[PDB]
Design a protein around this ligand. Structure first.
Ligand code: HEM
Ligand code: HEM
Ligand SMILES: [C-]#N
Ligand SMILES: [C-]#N
Ligand SMILES: [Cl-]
Lengths: 152, 152
């Protein structure tokens, strides 16, 4: 499978899983803010905003599901069940006809916010910041890999 | 096209371009190590390694073109001609039959190395680190977006 092959490629291990779970504790209180920044970016962008046409209640419901998505991202586990669920999430966006390039822009918003949260928490312990930064890069690149698999 | 719509989405500006140029000077002496790490990952991966059966000269030539790719990544400019060349690079990999998910694994190797060099150079100035780290995330995400466009 794509996730198994890529876990091997990127050197995914228990270290990455521990480091993400450490990040989860630091980041979870800020999930509402990360979701807010994510939708602010979609709604502020002329092309992306046209994908959201259910109004104020729609963004409210999407924030709830994105808080859950972030919780799973950093909490795991990152097993076949997890990745199977991520394929289904990719397919959702294929089916609504969302142009695939928006997935990269959107993931970059989370990448930027999560990287900042990692730095804020871990900068005083550089080797742990390195481990958390590295794990975060891997999980987000694997998420993209799996969600762009659904577009083919 | 995808670079222009996406550059607005991620907030690509002259600040990102200055940050990347500033990293270029610090990172460039380490490009050969980054390239070593990149090819060692391919050669150590059961699926990906089969793409490199052209011998020591193929790997040697690829290292040269990767050092150049990296120099362009951080030095720029990031103009129409740059992105047109990135499109052609993407198509090379489509033409040779490389599975698209390997592009994510391979980009992660560079992401991890480049993020480490950014920290090494800029950790004494946390606001500049933030700018450099943000710009690095954006350019790599844009690179993946363009590469994956060629696979469509
Ligand atoms: C990193 C990028 C993204 C992630 C992680 C993400 C995550 C999700 C999740 C978890 C769902 C719910 C799927 C379910 O029902 O189980 C969903 C649905 C949706 N997402 Fe996203 N999403 C992303 C990008 C985007 C973008 C860029 C847009 C629009 C600009 C978008 C618009 C939507 C819409 C409209 C739905 C609801 C679809 C429907 O059922 O009508 N998403 N997303
Ligand atoms: C971030 C990911 C990657 C980047 C930035 C990259 C970059 C490049 C560049 C700049 C070239 C030269 C293009 C040209 O001569 O016109 C190229 C060619 C090539 N790449 Fe990659 N590459 C990536 C991923 C991969 C992976 C994962 C593999 C194999 C596992 C691979 C195997 C090759 C091969 C075999 C060629 C030569 C094709 C030929 O014979 O003409 N590349 N790549
Ligand atoms: C999409 N939330
Ligand atoms: C391609 N190295
Ligand atoms: Cl950092």
């Amino acid at each position: 499978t794509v996730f198994e092959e890529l876990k091997r490629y990127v050197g995914w291990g228990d270290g990455d899983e521990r480091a993400l779970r450490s990040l989860h504790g630091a980041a979870a209180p800020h999930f509402p803010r990360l979701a807010e920044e994510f939708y602010d970016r979609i709604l502020g962008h002329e092309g992306a905003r046209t994908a959201l046409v259910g109004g104020e209640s729609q963004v409210g419901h999407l924030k709830v599901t994105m808080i859950a998505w972030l919780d799973e991202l950093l909490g795991g586990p990152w097993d076949e069940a997890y990745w199977d669920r991520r394929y289904r999430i990719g397919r959702v966006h294929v089916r609504i006809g969302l142009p695939q390039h928006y997935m990269f822009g959107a993931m970059n918003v989370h990448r930027t916010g999560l990287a900042r949260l990692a730095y804020e928490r871990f900068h005083g312990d550089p080797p742990e910041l390195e481990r958390v930064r590295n794990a975060l890069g891997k999980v987000l690149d694997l998420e993209l890999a799996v969600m762009l698999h659904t577009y083919r």
